[PDB]
Design a protein around this ligand. Structure first.
Ligand SMILES: [Cl-]
Ligand SMILES: [Cl-]
Ligand SMILES: [Cl-]
Ligand SMILES: [Cl-]
Ligand SMILES: [Cl-]
Ligand code: NA
Ligand code: NA
Ligand code: NA
Length: 164
């Protein structure tokens, strides 16, 4: 298991434009196209992202290219952020993946807003952090995914992603 496989489980893979669980246009492995309700706006975004005039459908290699960029961007979001970088630095590589997962789903600014959660993670108070992380819009709206990420923080193991 690693961050790529983890996010492939949590996000799925679709080769045509789809709406994610927020109702926003996406493609591939959880690649956000736009928060606009306009499908045409989403398709322009897609063409811009791929570099060609698509028909709203990409190949698996193209989806994996965007995914590889998006994972890279979630780390960039963490390492450039004064709140996220010290927590990441402090974590083992398995818990690092859980933090990348959150930033992939919610973005840098949103995960930086988990001030109290981040403090408990930096303190290595894993059960307390897990309780605090669940008191969120994130957990209520995507509970099974948040439970997997939270178990990863709580235990420092991949147990929530094995059998899947
Ligand atoms: Cl992009
Ligand atoms: Cl940086
Ligand atoms: Cl910052
Ligand atoms: Cl709490
Ligand atoms: Cl879920
Ligand atoms: Na998905
Ligand atoms: Na629409
Ligand atoms: Na995403």
């Amino acid at each position: 298991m690693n961050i790529f496989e983890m996010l492939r489980i949590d996000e799925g893979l679709r080769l045509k434009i789809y709406k994610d669980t927020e109702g926003y246009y996406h493609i591939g492995i959880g690649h956000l196209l736009t928060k606009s309700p306009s499908l045409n706006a989403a398709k322009s975004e897609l063409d811009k992202a791929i570099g060609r005039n698509t028909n709203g459908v990409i190949t698996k290699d193209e989806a994996e290219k965007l995914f590889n960029q998006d994972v890279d961007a979630a780390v960039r979001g963490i390492l450039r952020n004064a709140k996220l970088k010290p927590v990441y630095d402090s974590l083992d590589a398995v818990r690092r993946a859980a933090l990348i997962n959150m930033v992939f789903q919610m973005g840098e600014t949103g995960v930086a807003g988990f001030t109290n959660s981040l403090r408990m993670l930096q303190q290595k108070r894993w059960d307390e952090a897990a309780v605090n992380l669940a008191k969120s819009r994130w957990y209520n709206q995507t509970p099974n995914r948040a439970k997997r990420v939270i178990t990863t923080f709580r235990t420092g193991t991949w147990d929530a992603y094995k059998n899947l």
